[PDB]
């Protein structure tokens, strides 16, 4: 559960970084 | 429930990331 | 519970910023 929320929210956010560069 | 947390942390994280730029 | 998850995941992401930059 913890890893799911941490990895899910965190992975989507790093994706924001990649999209904006 | 969990999605609720995922959404609030996600919006705050994108804001701190931009603020730290 | 909520603050713990937000703060814990959020602090990890800030680590990504310092780790990348």
Curated annotation (Swiss-Prot), chains A, B, C:
Effect of residue 3 to V: In strain: 19B/501Y
Transmembrane segments: 1-15
UniProt superkingdom: Viruses
Role: Subunit of the fusion protein that is processed upon entry into the host cell. Mediates fusion of the virion and cellular membranes by functioning as a class I viral fusion protein. Contains a viral fusion peptide that is unmasked after S2 cleavage. This cleavage can occur at the cell membrane by host TMPRSS2 or during endocytosis by host CSTL. In either case, this triggers an extensive and irreversible conformational change that leads to fusion of the viral envelope with the cellular cytoplasmic membrane, releasing viral genomic RNA into the host cell cytoplasm.
Designated name of the protein: Spike protein S2'
Organism: Severe acute respiratory syndrome coronavirus 2 (2019-nCoV)
């Amino acid at each position: 559960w913890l890893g799911f929320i941490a990895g899910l929210i965190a992975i989507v956010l790093v994706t924001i970084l990649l999209s904006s560069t």
